[PDB]
């Protein structure tokens, strides 16, 4: 690792600087270096890791969608042939995206998940594992697409089971996990009814627990509750 010679604390400091500068590739590289120091991550550090790679893969996904759309049009009836270039460049972006996903999944497997014993860390990492298998699923078309989808499902399911046993229904990690697993159902697993049921049940159970919260916790929970409602409105 090119970050092997840098202090852990310096890597975390520079990840925060990179965030302020909107340099998310750098941020991700710094946080990968921090993970590879081998110590567990604090709550703040876990969110630095997720923010960094979410921004990196988010841009890749947006670019892949643009290129896939152009490629699909080039393959409609009546479209002038323009050669292999659209497919090639879509493939280039796709391979880079798969590489980022594999990197994140590698960090989770070596060895963040196995050392995560508290619910807040273990659910967080298993949600990430589901998310990055979901991004692999979005571009998958081969012999292993079903296995990629089931890897996402399995990670989300383990995270869901822990979150329901160990966290209140308003916990923002529990809420965000449910939000994203619901999207997995709708967009990946061809299960819109499951997606809608999960979003609605998560929203209603959170609603009933808001009375227990401080003003600041209320703000955090209702933010994600509104995303659940937004998706329900999109889907119904």
């Amino acid at each position: 690792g090119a970050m092997g010679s840098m202090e852990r604390a310096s890597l975390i400091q520079k990840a925060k600087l990179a965030e302020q500068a909107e340099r998310y590739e750098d941020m991700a590289a710094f946080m990968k270096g921090a993970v590879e120091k081998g110590e567990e991550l604090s709550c703040e550090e876990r969110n630095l890791l997720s923010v960094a790679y979410k921004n990196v893969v988010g841009g890749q996904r947006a670019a892949w969608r643009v290129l896939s759309s152009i490629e699909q049009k080039s393959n409609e009836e009546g479209s002038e042939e323009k050669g292999p270039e659209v497919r090639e460049y879509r493939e280039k972006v796709e391979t880079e995206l798969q590489g980022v996903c594999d990197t994140v999944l590698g960090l989770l497997d070596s060895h963040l998940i196995k050392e995560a014993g508290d619910a807040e860390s273990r659910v967080f990492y298993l949600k990430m594992k589901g998310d990055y298998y979901r991004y692999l699923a979005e571009v998958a078309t081969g012999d292993d697409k079903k296995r990629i989808i089931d890897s996402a499902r399995s990670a989300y399911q383990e995270a869901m089971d822990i979150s329901k046993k160990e966290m209140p229904p308003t916990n923002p990690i529990r809420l965000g996990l449910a939000l994203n697993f619901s999207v997995f159902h709708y967009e990946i697993a061809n299960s819109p009814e499951e997606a809608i049921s999960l979003a609605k049940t998560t929203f209603d159970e959170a609603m009933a627990d808001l009375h227990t919260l401080s003003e600041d916790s209320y703000k955090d929970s209702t933010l994600i509750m509104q995303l659940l409602r937004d998706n329900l409105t999109l889907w119904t």
Binding site: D131, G176, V183, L227, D230, L234
Partner: peptide, 5 residues
């Protein structure tokens, strides 16, 4: 696209 976090 739908919202994820």
């Amino acid at each position: 696209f739908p919202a994820t976090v």
